[PDB]
Structures are given as C-alpha cells and as structure tokens.
From Swiss-Prot, chains A, B:
GO molecular function: oxidoreductase activity
Cofactor: FMN
PANTHER family hit by this protein: NADPH NITROREDUCTASE, OXYGEN-INSENSITIVE NAD(P)H NITROREDUCTASE
UniProt KW keywords: Flavoprotein, FMN, NAD, NADP, Oxidoreductase
UniProt protein name: Putative NAD(P)H nitroreductase
Organism placement in taxonomy: Bacteria, Pseudomonadati, Pseudomonadota, Gammaproteobacteria, Pasteurellales
Biological process (GO), any one: 2,4,6-trinitrotoluene catabolic process
Family according to the record: Belongs to the nitroreductase family.
Broad EC category: oxidoreductase
A GO term from the CC aspect: cytosol
Residues at which NAD(+) binds: G154, A155, S156, A157, L158, G159
Gene3D superfamilies: NADH Oxidase
Amino acid sequence: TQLTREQVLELFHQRSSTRYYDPTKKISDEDFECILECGRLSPSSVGSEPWKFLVIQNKTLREKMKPFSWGMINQLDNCSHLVVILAKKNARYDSPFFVDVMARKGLNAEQQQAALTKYKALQEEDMKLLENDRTLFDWCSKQTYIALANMLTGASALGIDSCPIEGFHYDKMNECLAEEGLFDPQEYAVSVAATFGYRSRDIAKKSRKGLDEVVKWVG
Amino acid sequence: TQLTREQVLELFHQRSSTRYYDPTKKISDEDFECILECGRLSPSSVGSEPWKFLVIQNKTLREKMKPFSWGMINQLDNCSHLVVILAKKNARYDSPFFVDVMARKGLNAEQQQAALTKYKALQEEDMKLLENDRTLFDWCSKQTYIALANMLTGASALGIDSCPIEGFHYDKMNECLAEEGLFDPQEYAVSVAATFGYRSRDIAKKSRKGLDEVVKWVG
Ligand SMILES: Cc1cc2nc3c(=O)[nH]c(=O)nc-3n(C[C@H](O)[C@H](O)[C@H](O)COP(=O)(O)O)c2cc1C
Ligand SMILES: Cc1cc2nc3c(=O)[nH]c(=O)nc-3n(C[C@H](O)[C@H](O)[C@H](O)COP(=O)(O)O)c2cc1C
Ligand SMILES: Cn1cncc1[N+](=O)[O-]
C-alpha cells in the first residue's frame, strides 16, 4: 500500500517468468482470488473493462491444450492455476456493450449523448479503430494486457510465481474453449494467458536494455 | 517485496486516474527513475521490449500538444511528469530488431536458428501478426501496455498519482513528436501516454464490474 523505492525495485526484479512449477504446491483459494482482484481493479480506457478471466483448472482441458500450446506445454502439467484472458470483440462506441458501460456510470440521456460523441471521436478519429474488426479487437486486447501485468505483479507481491503466455495457436485456442461453451465466440476472443504457482528453480537474473537506451528525456 | 492480501488489494484499489494535479508538487529524480525502472523491468513477449519512453518535461512542447490532446488538456499544465510510450514498428522475426533481441541473450548460430524458428511460428502461425503493418505494430503496442501498467502501479506504491492517456489525435501526436526530432517515424509510433504527479482533488470511488461476471472458473 506504501512501499519504499528499494521495496518497489525488489518487487519488479523478483518477478520472473517461471517455466518450472512445483506440482506439490497449490495456490490457496484466498490468494488466487486476490490475484484476480488485481486484474478486476485494473485501469481501462474509458472504463471499458473489456476482459473476462477463464481459470482453467480442469486437467483434461489442460491436456487438450498441450498439442497447440508449445509456449506452455510443460507448465500446463505443473502450474497451480491457468488463466486465459479474453477480450471483447466489436466494442463499438454505439454498441450494447458501451450502453452497459454508461449505465454503470449513471449517465442521463444528455450525458450519454456527450459520452457517445467522445467515444466516437476516440474510436473513429483519434485511434482509427473502426478500420476493421482486428483493430477494434486489438484495442480492447491492449487493455487486457494491463490486467495481465497487474496480476503478475500482485501475485509476486504475494510470493507467488507466474508466467505470461502468448505461445499457442490462437485460432485453435479460441475454437477449443468455445466448444466447451466457456464463452460466446461472437462476443469475446482469447487475448493472452498466464500461469501461476510456486517456482521450482532459482530466479533467473533480469536482462533488459539499459535505462539510457529505453528512456529519452526532453527538457 | 512481500505484502498481505489486504496490502496487495489496497495497492491496486488506491490507484486511480488523476485528472487534477497540484502544479506546486514535483516528483523527485529518484522517485521518477524508480517509476521508469518499473517500466524498463517489465516482461515482454520473447523478451522483445519493444518500447521507448519519452519524458516530456519541456513546457512549450507540452503546450503544442494541448490543441489535439483533449484527454489530458488540463493535466498537461500541472502534472509533474509526462511520459509518451512508443512501440516498435515492423518488429518482424527476421528484422535487425530481433538480432538485437537475440544478441542480448548471447545466442550461438544454432541457438539463433532455433529462436528464429520460434519467432516465426509465433508471428506467422500462432498470432497471425504479418497480415499487415498495423497487426504487427499492435502486438508490440500490447507489450507497452504491460510497461504502462507497471509504471502506474509503481507510482501508486511510492505515493505518486497517475493517469493513463489515450485521449489525443494519434496522427497529430506522431507527427508533432517526429517533426521535432524525438523519434524515427519509420521505426516507432506513439502507443499510449501517462501523466504523473500529486492529485489536487479527492480520490473518486472505484467502480468496476463484479468479480462474478468477469471471472469464470472451469472445474
Ligand atoms: C505477453 C507476453 C507473452 C509471453 N509469452 C510467453 C510464452 O508463451 N512462454 C514463455 O515461456 N514466456 C513467455 N513470455 C515471457 C517472456 O519471454 C519474458 O517476459 C521475457 O523474456 C523477459 O523475461 P522475464 O519476464 O523473466 O523478465 C511472454 C511475455 C509476455 C509479456
Ligand atoms: C490505456 C488507457 C488510456 C486512458 N486514457 C485516458 C485519457 O486520455 N484521459 C483520461 O482522463 N483518462 C484516461 N484513462 C483513464 C480511464 O478513464 C480510467 O482508467 C477508468 O475510467 C477507470 O477509472 P480509475 O482508473 O480511476 O479506476 C485511460 C485509461 C487507460 C488504461
Ligand atoms: C512469447 N513466447 C512464446 N514462446 C516462448 C516465448 N517467450 O516469450 O520466450
């Protein structure tokens, strides 16, 4: 809630991508719903919250993922928890989805007419999102990477390890989770995944480009 | 480094988007560098780190932004620090950019060949990123939203308020920054921005969809 600079830097050095989990250690129900709160509470362009979290604990569905999920093939066998983050498809400014967003903010017919104009200008001319489905979807998916990041960091502050995952066939992952009836494929699609658990190896050392290469100061 | 579930929950609850900053209060050099380290230390797909952070402290450059940055037009004057995050354009697997990525990990001719095969599978087959230029830029831009999230969370842990920013004309933010020589527009493009400072009003109440509609457990 309040940390020193030393405690902050150590929080982000200690967070590593964990490829090897101890299958004997499970995350408690309490710890993991806290990790999920970190995602839920995440900021979100125009409060859109365009995410759904699938917690994949069924072991046979994990096995069914392995043939197309080379980026996590062994982690699927040993991680405590697997989260697949979906992102909202077709989140147009004039959609029922954004009517839900305005309703959660209590906007009158006037404030709605102002908000929709702002949504429209953000989507249509600021960010050029309405070119095709993929560009609008990728806008929501970006918001979900905020939720992903916060879940990795909250987990690590709880002493729980994690690993973000893009290494899988996205079309096959979308099909397989839709055929289990886990989400409506016209409404949502897979954005990114993450495993969680307790590492079985030492933390690898951070390798990054230096601060002088990634930062540019304009005084 | 290690918090409790209540500590973690308030760390993410206490962060909110600040639209009103105290022009009298400035972030320390040491406090901000630690914020920037939270970004630098963020995870990224295949270690790509496809970001650059422009810290816009120049006051008259901030003024040029106001005509096309309605999302932050009040914050521009009073915020302590403004960061504009760029994402790499054309980060193709076979590009010089990924030679740097492989170099930073010290990969032999055989290890580079395996890594190149994995990057190609990821980009062409799994995520279908080579459809056009926007799909590939939007992938790198997603990674930058991880960096963005961690900087907001690091700020909040240091007592520093923040607001993430998409409310500007991207076309005109790009050209304004590129014509002033701050990045190469064929190599990078604006992804998202964020202000940092100390709030001048009260923290508004968190409003989020309930955990029971954003989470679906699969047993
Ligand atoms: C969105 C995203 C997707 C990633 N996908 C995978 C993956 O499928 N499998 C994996 O082992 N690592 C994956 N990584 C981890 C990166 O390779 C890792 O973040 C990077 O090499 C830096 O290492 P560090 O996170 O340990 O600091 C992914 C990272 C991100 C942010
Ligand atoms: C990527 C991103 C871009 C945003 N752009 C803006 C913006 O331009 N101006 C602004 O005032 N708020 C902006 N917001 C803030 C959101 O409106 C805010 O996160 C959301 O309404 C939830 O409120 P909270 O962050 O206070 O919890 C942005 C949020 C995100 C994550
Ligand atoms: C992204 N990805 C996919 N497979 C492996 C990775 N990695 O980040 O090393």
